[PDB]
């Protein structure tokens, strides 16, 4: 997260970290045994880390639970990045509420201008490289599909949306992928891609969750 701020202690209980030896992607807990992340975050042997603002602490307040199933959307396209969403089932149920609570899925899509909260342990520098020890937060508005497509001609599908500021300075970055974009207490986005980080006229692109609610529910019910 570039141009963000240290989230309040346990203010983002639904935020999780996908681990493969170290933190590589973020994720959102949607219930006791299911996590939603980006499809490009798929790797074998993923372990999910929950309930801990500090990404390095071991034996703190965190919980490490192995992924028992990692289901990437069946139409994920690694070239166009369309349908960039994945579901991960935890081997065992996690303890909820305190520092680990699920985020509700949307009942309807958000609108441009709607202010949302984006979080992650990604890079905090747009040009350099500085990864934080604690979870970072950022308030960013959803941008009009019109300005999104103008920013990335021929790259935005109906399953994506832009959020952030065209002036640059504030945006998600490498290390934030799979992370949540919460608007009015609802998970509307998943950190996906962008041209660089926090660059002018190059806002962040996010997976449009409201388009996969049915897929998420049915997948969870069948597995």
């Amino acid at each position: 997260i570039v141009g963000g701020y240290t989230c309040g202690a346990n203010t983002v209980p639904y935020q999780v970290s996908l681990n493969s030896g170290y933190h590589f992607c973020g994720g959102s807990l949607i219930n006791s045994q299911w996590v939603v992340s980006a499809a490009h975050c798929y790797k074998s042997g993923i372990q999910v880390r929950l309930g801990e603002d500090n990404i390095n602490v071991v034996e703190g307040n965190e919980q490490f639970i192995s992924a028992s199933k990692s289901i990437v959307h069946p139409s994920y396209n690694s070239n166009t990045l369309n349908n960039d969403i994945m579901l991960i089932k935890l081997k065992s149920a996690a303890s909820l509420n305190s520092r680990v609570a699920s985020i509700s899925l949307p009942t309807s899509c958000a609108s441009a201008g709607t202010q949302c909260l984006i979080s992650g342990w990604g890079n905090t520098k747009s040009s350099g490289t500085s990864y934080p020890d604690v979870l970072k937060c950022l308030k960013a508005p959803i941008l009009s599909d019109s300005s999104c497509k103008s920013a990335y001609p021929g790259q935005i599908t109906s399953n994506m949306f832009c959020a952030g500021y065209l002036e640059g300075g504030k945006d998600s970055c490498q290390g934030d992928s799979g992370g949540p974009v919460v608007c009015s207490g609802k998970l509307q986005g998943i950190v996906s891609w962008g041209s660089g980080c926090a660059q002018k006229n190059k806002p962040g692109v996010y997976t449009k969750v409201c388009n996969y609610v049915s897929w998420i529910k049915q997948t969870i019910a069948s597995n």
């Binding site: 980006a38 490009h40 490498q174 290390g175 891609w193």
Partner: protein
């Protein structure tokens, strides 16, 4: 060595943080860099060994 070995490391548009290797032609050594997760170029390897076997030879 293949010409793609002379290209600078490409992080890409995606936003995950995974370590990969690339041949740094200027240093003549394979080194690590942060790959973003998608649209990788050929100078991107999962181990120093593979990077060296592919890009090490003159």
């Amino acid at each position: 060595r293949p010409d793609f070995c002379l290209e600078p490391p490409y992080t890409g548009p995606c936003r995950l943080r995974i370590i990969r290797y690339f041949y740094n032609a200027k240093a003549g050594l394979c080194q690590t860099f942060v790959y973003g997760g998608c649209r990788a170029k050929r100078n991107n390897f999962k181990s120093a060994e593979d990077c060296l076997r592919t890009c090490g030879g003159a």
